[PDB]
C-alpha cells in the first residue's frame, strides 16, 4: 500500500479482531432489545436503550473498519457468533450481563492499545483514546449507576421495579 | 344493482354480519368506558383508553357499511346485543375481555377474508386486509403487552398497580 | 403466547430464517463498501452505493425481528457467516455479484410468502408484498441497469469506464 | 525563560528543524501551482489543489512557532531551499512527488513525537497528535487515492485523463 506508513502488522490484526468483537456486542444487545419487546416481557424502554447501545456499538466497529482502509490496511471480516442466549430472564440480568460485556471489551481496546504504544503507533493510541475508551468507560459508570438503582428497588418488589425504572429511569 | 360485479351473495351477507359484530364491540367498550369513570372506580385513563377503542370500532363498522354500497350490495342492520356484564371487576379483568374480544373479531374477519377468497374477490381481500387486519393485530399485540405490565403490579399491590398503571401507561 | 393467533409454526421458522438471509446480506454489502474505499480500488460513490444496500438490509432484517414479536412468535438469531470475498474484483463484477445476491434474496422472499398463502395467512402475504417484494424488484431493476450501462463503457475502457460511472450515476 | 518548564534543549531545536521543513514544503508547493497555471498546462485545479497544499503547510509552520513560544523556548529561522525542480513534467509525477513528499514530513513529525516522548513531555505529544500527525495521515491517503484514479484514466489517454480528472476531481 502507498499510503501505508508505521502501520504494524500487529495493529492491523488486533484491529481486524476488535471490529468483530464490536459486531458480537451490537448482536447481544440487538438480542436483549429484541427480547424486551416480547408481548410477555413488555418493557419497551428496555429494549429502546439496548437499541441504543446496539446501534453504538456497531458505529464503533464501522469507524473502526474506516480507519484500517485510512492506514493502509486490509480489512478481513470472520463470521459473527450469536449471543450466548435467547432469552435474557429479566431487565436486572440484562444489565448486569452488559456491564460484563462493556467491561471485556474495554480490556481489548486496552489491549490493543497496548500494542499500539509498544509499536510506537502515536497515531493509533490517539485514536483509541477519543472517541473509543472514553465511550467505554462512561457506558460502564452509566451501566453500573443503573444497576444500583435496579437493585434497590428489586428488594422492594421485582415486578414493580422493572416497570418503574423502565418509565423514570430509561424514559 | 347496476354497480355490482363479481361480489357474491355469501360476501354481502358476510359483510353485514361483521358490521353487528363490530357495532356490539363498540357497544361493549362504552359499558367499560363507562364503568372506569364511576365514583367507585375512578380510573379516568382507563376509561379514555376503552373511549378510544369504541369509537375506532364503531368508525370501522361505518366503513364497512360503506363498502357494501361501493360494491354494490345491500344494507341490513340487525339489532345490536347489550354487552355481557355491566360491572367489569377491575382494570386487569376489562383487559382480558377486551383482549378474547379482540381476537373472536380477528377470527371473524380472516374468516370473511377467507370467503372473499374462496370467490375470487382481489379487491374485498385488499380491502380487508388494510387497514382491517392489520389494525386488529396490533391491537391484540397492545392489549397483550398492557396485561403483561399489570400483572407484574399486580403481584405487589393491585391497589397501587391500578393506581400507577392508568396514571403511567394509560396517560 | 397470549397475542398468537393464526400464525404457523413453519411460518415463524421461515422469519427467523430470513432475518439471518438479511443479516448475511447486509454483512456482504458492508464488506463490498469497504472494498471501495481502499487506496488502490478509490471509487467512493461505489462504496457509498453498497453502504446504502447495506444500511437497507439491516433495516429489513430488524423490522422482521419486530414482525416476529407482533404476531407473537419467538426470535432465533443464529449466527451470520462472513462473505465469500474479500477482495471484490472491480466494479463490475461487484454489481453482478450485487443482482445475484438481491435475486437469491428475492427467491426466498416468494417461498416465504408461498408458505404464508399455504397457511392461509393473509396478515403475513399483505406484509411480505409492501415493502419488501417491492424493494425487491426496484432494486433488481436498478442494479441490471447499472450493469448495462457500466459494460457499454467497459468495452471502450475499464479505466475509465468505472472512474465516469462513479462520478455520473454513481453520484 | 520564566515560562519554561519540562521543555527540552531536543524537542526546542527538533521543534526548529521541522518549522524549516514544512516551510520547504509549502514553497514546493507553491512550485507546483505556479507550473499548472502556465499557459502551457493550464490544469487551474491541479493548480488550486497545491495552493491549498502549499497554504496549510505553511499556517502548520505558524503555529509551530507560536508553540515554541508558548513553551519558553527560541525561534531561529534558517534559510528556506528552493524546490528541487521548476518544471514538474505533468499532473501524475506532481502528484506523486507529493506522496513522497508527504510521508518524509510524516516521518519528520514521528521522529519529533518519540523525542518527546522520550523526554517525557506529555504537553508536546499531545500537541503533535492533534492536529499534526492526523492531518498527516489524512492527505496522504487522499493523495493515494488520486494518484490511484489518474493511474486508471492514464491508462487509456494521458491528454483526456488529466483534463478530465482536474475537472471532475479537483473541480
Same mark, same amino acid.
Given at each position: ?5 508505521? #502501520?504494524?502488522?500487529?495493529? %492491523? ?22 427480547? #424486551? ?10 429494549? @429502546? ?8 456499538? @456497531? ?5 473502526? &473498519? ?16 450469536? =449471543? ?15 456491564? @460484563? ?20 503507533? =502515536? ?5 483509541? %483514546? ?7 468507560? %462512561?457506558? &460502564? ?5 443503573? &444497576?444500583?438503582?435496579? @437493585? ?9 421495579? %422493572? ?9
Amino acid at each position: 500500500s502507498q499510503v501505508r506508513q508505521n #502501520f504494524h502488522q500487529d495493529c %492491523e490484526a488486533g484491529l481486524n479482531r476488535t471490529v468483530n468483537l464490536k459486531f458480537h456486542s451490537s448482536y447481544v444487545y440487538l438480542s436483549m432489545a429484541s427480547y #424486551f419487546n416480547r408481548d410477555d416481557v413488555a418493557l419497551s424502554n428496555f429494549a @429502546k436503550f439496548f437499541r441504543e447501545r446496539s446501534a453504538a456499538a @456497531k458505529a464503533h466497529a464501522e469507524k473502526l &473498519i474506516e480507519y484500517q482502509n485510512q492506514r493502509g490496511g486490509r480489512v478481513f471480516l470472520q463470521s459473527v457468533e450469536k =449471543p450466548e442466549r435467547d432469552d435474557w430472564a429479566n431487565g436486572l440480568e440484562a444489565l448486569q450481563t452488559a456491564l @460484563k460485556l462493556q467491561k471485556s471489551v474495554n480490556q481489548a481496546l486496552l489491549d490493543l492499545h497496548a500494542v499500539a504504544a509498544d509499536k510506537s503507533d =502515536p497515531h493509533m493510541t490517539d485514536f483509541l %483514546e477519543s472517541p473509543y475508551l472514553s465511550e467505554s468507560v %462512561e457506558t &460502564i459508570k452509566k451501566l453500573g449507576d443503573h &444497576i444500583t438503582s435496579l @437493585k434497590k428497588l428489586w428488594s422492594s418488589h421485582p415486578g414493580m421495579a %422493572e416497570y418503574l425504572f423502565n418509565k423514570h429511569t430509561l424514559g
